[PDB]
Amino acid sequence: LGGVAYTRRKHEESYDKHEEDRDGRVTNPSRVVQIDGDLAAPHVGHTFFVPGHTRVTSGGTDTVYSPKLYQEPVFPLFPGAVWNPNPLSYDCQIWTKIPNTECHFFAQYP
Amino acid sequence: KAQWIGGTSFSDSVVITSHTRTSMLADRGGYVPVYKQGSHVDSSQPVMGMKTPYSYIDVNALSAHFTPRDFQQLLDEYDEIKPKSLTIAISAIVIKDVATNQTGTTVSDSASGGITVFADDSYDYPYVLGHNQDTLPGHLPGENYVLPQYGYITRGREIDQQNSIVAISDHKTELFFLEHHDAECLGTGDHWSHHYEFPDDLPWRKLSTPNQTLYARHNPIPSSRLAIMTGVDNDGTAIWKRPEGMDVGRLPLNYVPGPALMMPTDTQIRNTTFRDPVAIGNPATSDRYSVAPLVHQPWSVRTEEWLANKTDYAVHNYLGGVAYTRRKHEESYDKHEEDRDGRVTNPSRVVQIDGDLAAPHVGHTFFVPGHTRVTSGGTDTVYSPKLYQEPVFPLFPGAVWNPNPLSYDCQIWTKIPNTECHFFAQYPLLGGWGVLTPPPMIFVKLRSQPGPPSPGAHTVPQSNLNQYAIFHLHYSMQFLVKRRKRSRRHNPEKPAPFPTTDSGRMPFTLANSLKDPNTPVYEVPSDQWIARNYSHLL
Amino acid sequence: KAQWIGGTSFSDSVVITSHTRTSMLADRGGYVPVYKQGSHVDSSQPVMGMKTPYSYIDVNALSAHFTPRDFQQLLDEYDEIKPKSLTIAISAIVIKDVATNQTGTTVSDSASGGITVFADDSYDYPYVLGHNQDTLPGHLPGENYVLPQYGYITRGREIDQQNSIVAISDHKTELFFLEHHDAECLGTGDHWSHHYEFPDDLPWRKLSTPNQTLYARHNPIPSSRLAIMTGVDNDGTAIWKRPEGMDVGRLPLNYVPGPALMMPTDTQIRNTTFRDPVAIGNPATSDRYSVAPLVHQPWSVRTEEWLANKTDYAVHNYLGGVAYTRRKHEESYDKHEEDRDGRVTNPSRVVQIDGDLAAPHVGHTFFVPGHTRVTSGGTDTVYSPKLYQEPVFPLFPGAVWNPNPLSYDCQIWTKIPNTECHFFAQYPLLGGWGVLTPPPMIFVKLRSQPGPPSPGAHTVPQSNLNQYAIFHLHYSMQFLVKRRKRSRRHNPEKPAPFPTTDSGRMPFTLANSLKDPNTPVYEVPSDQWIARNYSHLL
């Protein structure tokens, strides 16, 4: 989810326009499937473990809220870190304009 | 040759601002520590502190250097101001002697007095400038500038002995005698100036607002050639949707917004108050320390109401936001210290108009699918995880943001802490320009004149002769600027809103009477003037 | 080498504006006179007139040269704009042939067509530019500019024969065949440009408002050293009064205001209308001709109401004032010619905000003594003379005034009539700059292609082949300007009010729909934009 796939264009395709399909439902786009040769295997849990309670904020914090839940979404960029951007699909756009803005971060990789 | 310096000069290249103000040196006591123990019940935390007989000059604000009209022209004709240099000159030193008599207090020149001034080019003393503490020249020339005393915090071993935390100071306690250092004895008729130049490495701070919403830049006419996965259907269908150009929220984008704390702004109406807005600390209730403007975000957003385009918009102040406290302008017997715990009414709130690169926003992933169907009911436990609202949307590799604009009261520089590795430190969250080598702290003190020596009789040194120095303080600062390249557009572009005073009178002017005839009330805008004036395409 | 020219360039010295617009040459009939007899019952006056097959290009307005945004920057950063030069280039000439058939109208290129263009550097033909007649390029690029036909008024012997006055034309009637003159035949693929430079003698027209009331400039602190005679007492006492500095109305002044017509502005509410506002004529009822903006005065003054600082101020329009008629922007089937006698609703009124050098004023000597005691009851007659209210306060030797500002639609130049002696002619009452040698009128016409010749059979020449030319019209104009020297003051100075549209939408922009989807409505401000932006000390 949040992935992106290039829509297959109609090649000299006559009267197949089929605009009658609305809200842009697209069948069979090019999906940019990586083979999992990735620098790191596909992964989802920041800290996944099954100790039981953390024994800090163990039952709950200052409230009924049960905090510091082991699954944390969006594992964040830390100071020591290494990654590769997405490869170049044959349909990949070549360039883009880094928005004209005061400070940007790794903007060279769209 | 002493000449009173003043006036500003705009050029296409550079802005040169100059002020001169009568200054005073009180006699500050000897080195005194101030040790305030902390308490875990409250938020207090132990500080060892030090107070020094020395006094320094903090010239750091834009308001100091740019006359309001000079700040106005700054925006009208320019963009991208970066500070170039800073000169400071003490001159016209004259040192009075305060003789206290039963007759009365009679001040008289001391031909023999002196002051002792030096600057740290080596940054070898705790650098206290740039933390936004109110020591500054009053906005009104003719308001004497009494130089702030110098002190510095130091830490010991900080132990929780009881409900109250105290610093025993068995380590890491430092004592800086500025007495022991090379300084220049000055006296009546001496001129001491110190010229300083900021790094060339400083970034250009734009004075202009971004034109376009970050996420809507594209041709509204075409459909995208990408298909976002909307969601899965019919058990594995994975339906795809090609967003049209118009669809701004739904179009996949190359560049994400900068970080955000997604804090509630006036959404809580509850009379209860946050002890501290944002604090990274590791005490459940034991202690904390704030990180207030933890990100570059509008501290306060205009957020126009809709009731028939209500004349007074509801201004939303984000918790952790910061507002400049209005100083008292030649204000006599209004000190009103009886208000304690620093409750401040009507500060300048730095209200952005939501011309922001990206609209104010709060939810990282906000959606209403129902269960994620990974960790859907709960993870390995009763804990119901991966909750859709995630606070503190994080900085990712592709990302774009703008730091806060330059308020007319914004601090000009600050010292990037001397540390091994820092990240975007050149943009201070709270102010204008982080600098590795900042303008030196210029330490000044009266040359001490002791009283008559006793014939070794009572072994109590007579107090120093009471005296104080008054002098002109020339401080000139040069800014590098670039004239605005106007977006080539056919529309007249509505200017940034002219300041507004609560009083309704013109801002930055002397009003005759506010329920007095005695002294004029200098009037500052209701909200902080923001240096963002004209749009520019991003 | 034909290149489309466009865009403006601001410099400290000079402003260079360039536009290019597809233009058209209709086929204009042969020389035709238009003789309209005058009537004394009405205000009509006989005009002999002439209409010419030639057509000329009238580029004269500021609105033509300065894009609204380019006019905005003009004021923000500049003062004292004076026009430096004017280039005009015809290029990309292409000449269609309109073939009317029962099939239909089929336009087709004519490789053989031509146009014939020349300019008057000798001013030997009636100079028709600069009278503010609506022939101009539409504000919207993409609105084709169809060149105006050329005609000229000439006078004969004008006799009152009856209720209706007619010109018998037994004298002073002139016939200008522009055919007989050196012109340059142009055709498809030809470039013709004519560069022109205004005199250096032109005055600098200030873009900034005077700061101070004319009559209050002095030190409020001292009393004057002069004594005005207030009036006589005790039969010859002649009491004198020394005005204090504060007394602004009563202090004798070195420099009087300029002339004034002291006309009523919305003080008459009566439904009756003036046939003509101001007319110097010598017929009791027989005839007149207006002098409308007879002086330099605000045509319309803002004159803020007082009802709690009423949101919509009552705008007072002085009789004899003038307002620019809003042109229809690509407006289809709204021509509405059915409204006759040129009643115009909602023109741009050139409303000054009363930042004037001297407040709006009407009475020369207004006072209430009672009798003058010279000519007190009456003079030599029943006539009661020297009436206190005197209209048309006259220009005296010591005097000071400013001409009208530069509206965004203000005409740029006009031709000072060729006459023996003229007075302040360099300031036209109605517009920007009087010039002795103005930009030449550039006369253009289709090279006429006659139809098939008859074998001398019916002796009626076939009509010319119907055809029309379309071409790019490059017109670039350079303005000399001076960057503003800001008054050195501590106040931020409130900018000139940003334009306001009746619609409330942003000015000079394309609005999607006004009760239509079909075409966008270009929106111009409710009132004329005035080039006066920032105060300056007078």
PDB file of C-alpha atoms in Angstrom, chain B residues 6 38 45 68 194 275 510:
ATOM      1  CA  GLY B   6      23.650  56.015  12.948  1.00  0.00           C
ATOM      2  CA  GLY B  38      15.525  21.345  41.897  1.00  0.00           C
ATOM      3  CA  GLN B  45      16.010  21.167  38.140  1.00  0.00           C
ATOM      4  CA  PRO B  68      10.969  49.377  11.642  1.00  0.00           C
ATOM      5  CA  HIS B 194      35.714  45.169  17.710  1.00  0.00           C
ATOM      6  CA  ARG B 275       3.221  21.633  32.727  1.00  0.00           C
ATOM      7  CA  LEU B 510       4.921  57.429  19.865  1.00  0.00           C
TER       8      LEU B 510
END
